[PDB]
Every structure is written in C-alpha cells, then in structure tokens.
C-alpha cells in the first residue's frame, strides 16, 4: 500500500486512486493539501517522509524538490507515454506531466462570433472590449497568465494588460461566476479556464448554452496550459508500488480514469475525453518556464500596481 501526498482536486485524485486499487489490488491513501504546502512538508521531512508519491495540479512545484534531491527517477518508458510536443519534461527524469488545463475565452455566440475574437489575449484588455470582457483577478490561473505574459513579453506589457483590464473589463469573483455572467447576458465574453465550460456543457448539453469557447492558440500567452503531474519520493521505502502507481497514471486506463473524473486534457495521444475536449496538440500551448514562488510574488506586485 502507498501514501500519496495530493495537491490535485479530490475527484481527480480519488478517481485514479480507486481505478488503481481496482486494477492492482494496491491500496492508496491520500494526504491532501495545497501543492506549495505539501512540497514544503516533503522538503522538511526529507529522508523520513511517509510519502511515496506526490500528485500535483501544478508541475512547477516539482523543480525545487528535484533540485533538493528528493525525487526518484521514473521509467523512461513511462515518461514517453505523455511526452507530446510542448509537454514539460523533467531534466532529471524525476517527475512526469500527466494532464493539462487551458486558459480560454468564453463568449455568447448569440451576440459575438469567432470573427469578433482577437488573435491575442493582449487585445481583450483594450477599449474595443470596454464593458465586454470579464476577468477573474483572484484566480490562480489568472496569476499564471500574468506570470507567462511577464516572461514572454516583459513587465511593461504585463502591467499594461492588467491596467487595460482595470479600465475595460468586468471583474468577477470566480471563473464559474464569469461563465454564468456570459450565459445570463451580463457580459458577452470572459477570460476563464476550460474545465468550467466543459463541466456546464456536459451537464446541460452544448445546444442549450448561449456560450461557446474561443481558443487563441498559436502559442499566444493566452493559450497557456498549466500541467498536473506526479513524482515518486526518493525516500520512499516502497519504490516498487510507488513506481507502479506513477506508471498507472501514465497508462491508458489511468488517463481514462482521470478524464472521466475531470475536464483536463490527457497527455496520452490515444485517450479521448468524454467531456469532448480537443486533442492537447491542437491547443498550441506556449512553452514557458515553471512558475516559482518568486514569480507569483512578482505577478501579485503587478496586479497591485495596476490597481486590481
Ligand atoms: Fe478554478
């Protein structure tokens, strides 16, 4: 039996754990928490941690653990299962990316069309969109979007984007609320994450929604994908079952279990999502370095400076 420190959503984690227990007969215990807190706990515990595997919604939390020598190597064959073009790879082959979530633009297709959409997420923060674009400044993915803009286009552009949202956008407390506002006719479009919309569409049927999704694609900062993954702890005294769990997560059945539970893009090429997601490769996600704590601190400073 194994212990998994879990920073991912409980439904994702519970569903793959249960499919693992059913496939192998090995029992999984989750120790859930926020990825950044769990990572800190793993570093403090060091070679006496009870953790066998670390399962996270955000692969960026792994870099520090790897650099501190706390992660075990994973099978090369396992890594290759999700190694699509654009998918982040552990330089030391000591963690694996498993799935993704995407930034998207949701729009009311009875008021706007694909033709009204912009080639860049930068352009939604301009007077053309005044009173017409919702955004969620408190959302973790929104913070990731600022980090990517900063890295890809520099601080002046990031700040100008945030200042433009301040001036032109409608602020919503959550992505689900921004989605409702589009459905309700309050705002014709918003910047959200993919899964909120695919959840609603699975629930109600796409034909019954006013809203559709526009993916900016072509490695625009607005095509940002955030990656979930897993790692085996070097300290684990059950490497064999820990590695079997990580291999299962990368397998067809493990990826099938994940996508049945959550609207994340599988990184295996031979699994389709029952939420009817497009293939990961079609997203044309940009390639961007892992968000550090320092990156998050800086992005918060820019949001503050923009008056948000
Ligand atoms: Fe969310």
Swiss-Prot record:
Listed transmembrane segments: none
Consequence the record notes for mutating residue 36 to A: In strain: TN106
Superkingdom in the source lineage: Bacteria
Gene Ontology CC entries for this record: periplasmic space
GO BP: iron ion transport; transmembrane transport
Keyword annotations from UniProtKB, A to Z: Ion transport, Iron, Iron transport, Metal-binding, Periplasm, Signal, Transport
UniProt: Fe cation binding residues: 9, 57, 195-196
Name of the protein in question: Iron-utilization periplasmic protein
Organism encoding this protein: Haemophilus influenzae (strain ATCC 51907 / DSM 11121 / KW20 / Rd)
């Amino acid at each position: 039996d194994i212990t998994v420190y879990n920073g991912q959503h409980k439904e994702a984690a519970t569903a793959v754990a249960k499919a693992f227990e059913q496939e192998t007969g090995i029992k999984v215990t989750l120790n859930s928490g926020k990825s950044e807190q769990l990572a800190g706990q793993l570093k403090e515990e060091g070679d006496k941690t009870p953790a066998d595997v670390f399962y996270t919604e955000q692969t960026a939390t792994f870099a520090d653990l790897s650099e501190a020598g706390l992660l075990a190597p994973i099978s090369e064959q396992t890594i290759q299962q999700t190694a699509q073009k654009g998918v982040p790879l552990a330089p030391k082959k000591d963690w694996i990316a498993l799935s993704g979530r995407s930034r998207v633009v949701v729009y009311d297709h009875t008021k706007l069309s694909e033709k009204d959409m912009e080639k860049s997420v930068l352009d939604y923060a301009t007077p053309k969109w005044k009173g017409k674009i919702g955004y969620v400044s408190t959302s973790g993915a929104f913070l990731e979007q600022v980090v990517a803009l900063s890295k890809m286009k520099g601080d002046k552009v990031a700040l100008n984007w945030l200042k433009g949202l301040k001036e032109n956008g409608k602020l919503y407390a959550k992505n689900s609320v921004a989605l409702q506002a589009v459905e309700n006719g309050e705002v014709p479009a918003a910047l959200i994450n993919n899964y909120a919309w695919y959840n609603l569409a699975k629930e109600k049927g796409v034909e019954n929604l006013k809203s559709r999704l526009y993916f900016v694609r072509h490695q625009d900062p607005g095509a940002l994908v955030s990656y979930s993954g897993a790692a085996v702890l070097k300290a684990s005294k059950n490497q064999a079952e820990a590695q079997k769990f990580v291999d299962f997560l990368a397998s067809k059945k493990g990826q099938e279990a994940l996508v049945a539970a959550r609207a994340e893009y599988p990184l295996r090429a031979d699994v389709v999502s029952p939420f009817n997601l497009e293939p990961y490769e079609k997203l044309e996600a940009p390639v961007v370095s892992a968000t550090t704590a320092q990156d998050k601190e800086h992005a918060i400073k820019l949001i503050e400076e923009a008056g948000l």
